Design a protein around this ligand. Structure first.
Ligand SMILES: [Mg+2]
Ligand SMILES: [Mg+2]
Ligand SMILES: [Mg+2]
Ligand SMILES: [Mg+2]
Lengths: 392, 131, 380, 392, 380
């Protein structure tokens, strides 16, 4: 027992207050409070360690889970308690998902937040404290400030990952992916900056840097007789601005490119979480004639109904689906349903994270047709990518 | 589906006992969340059912058809049954057959009946089948 | 060394193969049942059974009912399932065995791999913090006792009433507090069950106190989930009748927090108890936002503030201000205030200075089992 | 250390002699000797325990492995040593296969059989002796004599297992399977008598008892308008008699049955191991117009070439193939090749041991079409079987 | 507590993630290499390394050559592979690590699950019968020594020659016999390697004996597998030359059994040694069928019978008959007979009565290391 450390993530000030008041009574140590991602990552950066993070897995003002992912990379966090005692069927899967982050699952708090229950979880924590991995302050998680300067010093480069046919590896298109040329840390993937950029409204800034590097590349491909369309990730926040579609079109014209030379990708969660006003940009990109892909798909069907006409020409299945094939074979049934869905809508399906040939063959067996992953090609910088695009 | 979402933490005990006993378990109003395909994966229902709006939006919405197709594939790949609700006419009955559906409920067959009406419905139907 | 295994297996060839695999590895006796009725008779006359084994994939509703018989007998410790449990319902199945008050030792498929029967035996004897199985058994076996903490008057000696507290006589750990079982009971919905054991004990104690000419009011904690129950109030009266004790002899406490999340229909029980005449306390008052709004809308006859107000007085003057405000509040509504966790004389006089009448803490008495309390009561 | 017990199975008297002579020098205890199955099961029956069985996995005069299987059911045997240090790729699979029998794998002896090497294996045994499961004399393994009387007292009954289409469960045919109505042990499957019958040349006797019970049943099905063909297992030894095909035809005529109403099944190993003279009966059954199935298939292709024309109308895949699907997914590739084979030969494929619906769906996905197993129907006695054959 | 881990990981982000995962669980230092050359330099100046980690799926021929560097340095104990090894080549991969003389601790996939890095650390320190890794290291490290057992004359004191025997100075178990390593060496093809260490030692001992005026013939056991080798005979001479010892100073023994399964081309080496003038013994004579047919077809200059003939004399007269027959046989072909395992005087005189000239056993001398033997030899 000592200076326990508890971070509460709670969006709703009255729940926060109830929870915090209960924790003050019973917790020996400090209670920290976050209302949003910004407070949360700030609190995390200043703390040396955070022993227990109390988290609500569906907030309006904050993505709880994304904070957890970031937190798990920080080194600073032992354990998680959930303040929503939700969804009995999906409870194990929720636990494991927490546990694969590095984190220890302590239990759920009820929406009572009874004082008795709280002490149970503390005794429980306290009996595990030693067996838990050491908390260290990992220097590899770039700070907000540090992210903010990289983004101001042109050190973010576009990489390109081919989407290919599963039988053969014939080239079909590519996704443009963000990499950080970190001055002293090397080359970083989105795990190391994206969440911060999302939380400080810096994504729009990254997109405009990468989108024009990418159009440059798309221009070079055109010139090469290589009809490879390039796809860019659009974060839901960016849909905020009424002029996105118009800015994107001005830029396409500027680069001598037709809308059809390009695609944009938004996650399902993103599309779900966006106001109708914001959804109007997709409709616009759709009318301009850009490709549109709904990304990280696989959860259900109710995203199909948000808009009058389905603006999507492509669906992409979440990377985790390939990994789960052996691990949890019932996921093959979802792959089948999604194959069947895409065909019935007359749109295309990409499956990501294809690493072994045994996966490739099974995916072909299920009816999949287009794929991305290490088995075919890693994300490349432009010239490697251009050279890669000479071989048919 | 939504009911199961809001269900009490002890729910799985009852569900597992039913499954272990061998009673059927249907997930009704399938697709009303938020995590629908993930949830089916984590519990072995022997049947899923589609809300009647799916069949109604079949003329206007090619999308409704798509999700029917998808769900037909989902159930066949899990080896479980699918019931489509709201079958009100014969043209939507044949469209459903093209899509690969097999089991249905709806006014075209019979609205809900009290016991004796239901028994008489059953007798008649059996008699019809045997010719 | 030497274990006592009982196998329930209908299919005779399966029985044959199973038992034979068990002879090779199991040091000790082995028993055999071709169905539920024959197994329930091996139980009806036998000693301890270290491991029960049955097949839940093949049957089914017999296997379940068996395990309950196994449960009811009090005679079985552990379970091996004779089919492999599906990865997706692993925790479901284990939890189901444990709500029977049986320990889940493990599972395995027929015909048994001999190394696997060893792994589980090693694991089993290797078991020679309380578990779910432990709590259920403890509860099915009358190990839970009621404790008594008096509500005294601060000035004078005083004795006004008592809070009935749940304790568990553990056969190996000894007396334990709710945190070591309320989690389990809360998660698995045994709170009601514990409540009624304690309410009965509590009324029995209430009688002995009426026999002795003592107006000691006994207060019981009610979990919010119970508040939703169709016949709680009607059942509390039936027992108050059966015991010939009057409503007012007794009080029910519910925290402010728990009252927040209480089920839509909680009020149906609350009007009952209020009319009846039972005292109704709002416990750990000052925990939500609208505390003062709550007292307004429900006529609670008592307010309780917790350990932390008292502790904070000396170092934190705002606590004193709210203690005083609450004193005023109870004063203006004509109800009682209990201040919890008084440990020192300094604390006691301060409370008086402030205006508080009733208290609990280690200054006066720590929670006590029936007799120590009765003795305590014979003396004031 | 004590009276170690060693049984050597060796066919070839000069190898046996070399091995035994080496063992006599170095083994503390008794060396037992078997030249064939008969000596081996006799030695086993009289022994209380056999600590180490030394086995040659390919003999001419004895099936080493089948003896091991029988031995594993006896309770009496700790460990196995192999006297062929063969096949590096298949060595792990060979070990596991031994280990799933109940048995402990000690090591391989070289075809030198060096005295030094022998003592290693003994020290090795001796360090494991305690950790090994107790040797008990299991009374459930009926003796040879006891098998011989059952077979003389009409207590062997035919059971029938349906072969059905994988989508639906539509009835297609059935295999006839041997069960022992044991007077005091209950109802026994072939594990408990077949190996003994094989080794004492009693199979021919069992076949004639079951074959006529089965024709009786086939007759009843005909009469019911139920065109279900029944398939009977023919052990390779039975092919010994020049008159088998003629005896089978006389019997079919006697029961008012055309050859086409019936099928016969022989394992691949059986077909491989038979003299050409003996293979001539299959040719005859084939000409008469009986169905023929090659049973427990899956090992390779060289069995296809034994005869001028392939007499087989059906192939059946070894039960283990369904179990290995999750356990070892490369086995799905063999299922595919076998599907492709059967189709190319225009013959049918049955897959056995189908127990779960997840297997059923995967098998359909691979192209399988006909199946047997617990998922569809258990082996039934005649009347249950007949009643089962009313439902379409 | 505290361990010293060395990670070889090319891909810098992978390096970053790996090392960071290792800080959390690994109590002690951690080192880092971006390729083979940098790792081989971390080795070139460092102490013990408890665990080396590298990725064999991603690269490849670098990873292998590294592990050999790890091997050659003598400085690393254990290995964790930083990708998951395919179930079908599990034993293959382990065995491959162990023929490097490294222990296989375990494998796991990037990014590492923290609980898995714990499992393997617990397992690792938990290792604080000899293994393959142990034998290889022992052999790469000059722990194997030659022992000497004299062939004496039965009547008189006698000293005719000696059999060179392989023993292993184990840093923890001490002196061990072939059964505790020949299996491993036989299985993994290290017999040749052991042979040449011992043959060199043996000739060095042979020189010291020639320096002392002693015609003690040294006999070495040749494994049948070597007999197939292209240049065995040519290599035995080159060493006999390098040592200025004559062929006849030396003898090679091969069992009758092993001679049966010997490779097609074994004779090419055997004519060599015979011409050369080296003595050739057929050891454990009387083990196959055609023993007498064998002596006919190859001019062996010595026959040896083993421990069991001597032991069986007293209780089993047929042994005596074959001892006598063999005496006659050796007598008629003009070659020597050695009878092994003489432990008692009774045994000794009986052998004489029968006609045997040479013996070995504990009566005269148990096997001895270089010096005890040399002393033994200075004395007859
Ligand atoms: Mg994307
Ligand atoms: Mg209370
Ligand atoms: Mg068959
Ligand atoms: Mg020798």
């Amino acid at each position: 027992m000592n200076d326990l450390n508890v971070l509460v993530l709670e969006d709703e000030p009255f729940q926060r207050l109830v929870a915090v008041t209960a924790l003050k009574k019973v917790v020996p140590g400090s209670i920290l409070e976050a209302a949003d991602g910004k407070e949360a990552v700030a609190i995390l950066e200043s703390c040396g360690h955070v022993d227990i993070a109390i988290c609500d897995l569906q907030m309006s003002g904050m993505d709880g889970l994304a904070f957890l992912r970031h937190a798990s990379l920080s080194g600073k966090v032992h354990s998680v308690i959930l303040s929503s005692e939700v969804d009995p069927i999906l409870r194990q899967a929720t636990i494991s998902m927490i546990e694969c982050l590095g984190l220890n699952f302590l239990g759920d708090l009820g929406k009572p937040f009874s004082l008795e229950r709280i002490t149970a979880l503390l005794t429980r924590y306290n009996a595990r404290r030693q067996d838990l991995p050491r908390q260290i302050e990992v220097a590899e998680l770039p700070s907000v400030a540090d992210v903010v300067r990289g983004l101001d010093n042109g050190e973010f480069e576009a990489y390109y990952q081919p989407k290919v046919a599963l039988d053969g590896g014939g080239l079909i298109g590519a996704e443009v992916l963000a990499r950080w040329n970190h001055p002293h840390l090397g080359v970083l993937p989105p795990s190391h900056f994206l969440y911060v950029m999302e939380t400080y409204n810096l994504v729009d800034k990254l997109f405009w840097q990468l989108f024009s590097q990418g159009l440059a590349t798309r221009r070079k491909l055109a010139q090469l007789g290589q009809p490879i369309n390039l796809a860019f990730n659009v974060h839901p926040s960016q849909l905020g601005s009424r002029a996105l579609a118009e800015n994107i079109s001005a830029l396409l014209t500027e680069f001598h490119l037709p809308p059809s030379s390009v695609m944009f990708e938004i996650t399902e969660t993103g599309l779900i979480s966006a106001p109708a006003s914001s959804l109007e940009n997709l409709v616009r990109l759709w009318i301009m004639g850009c490709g549109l892909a709904m990304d990280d798909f696989g959860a259900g069907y109710s995203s199909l109904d948000r808009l009058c006409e389905f603006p999507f020409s492509q669906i992409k299945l979440d990377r985790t689906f390939v990994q789960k094939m052996k691990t949890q074979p019932r996921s093959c049934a979802v792959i089948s349903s999604v194959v069947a869905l895409a065909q019935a809508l007359g749109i295309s399906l990409v499956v990501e994270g294809v690493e072994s040939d045994e996966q490739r063959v099974r995916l072909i067996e299920l009816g999949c047709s287009i794929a991305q992953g290490y088995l075919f090609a890693r994300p490349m910088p432009e010239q490697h990518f251009l050279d890669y695009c000479s071989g048919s | 589906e939504t009911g199961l979402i809001s269900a009490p933490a002890s729910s799985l005990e009852n569900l597992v006992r039913l499954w272990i006993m061998g009673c059927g378990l249907a997930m009704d109003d399938f697709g009303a969340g938020y995590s629908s395909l993930d949830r089916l994966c984590e519990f072995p229902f022997s049947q899923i059912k589609l809300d009647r709006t799916f069949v109604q939006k079949m003329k206007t919405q090619p999308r409704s058809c798509a999700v029917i197709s998808s769900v037909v594939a989902l159930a066949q790949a899990l080896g479980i049954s699918l019931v489509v609700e709201g079958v009100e006419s014969d043209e939507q009955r044949v469209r459903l057959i093209e899509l690969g559906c097999s089991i249905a409920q709806g006014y075209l067959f019979a609205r809900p009946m009290p016991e004796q009406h239901f028994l008489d419905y059953c007798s008649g139907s059996l008699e019809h089948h045997h010719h």
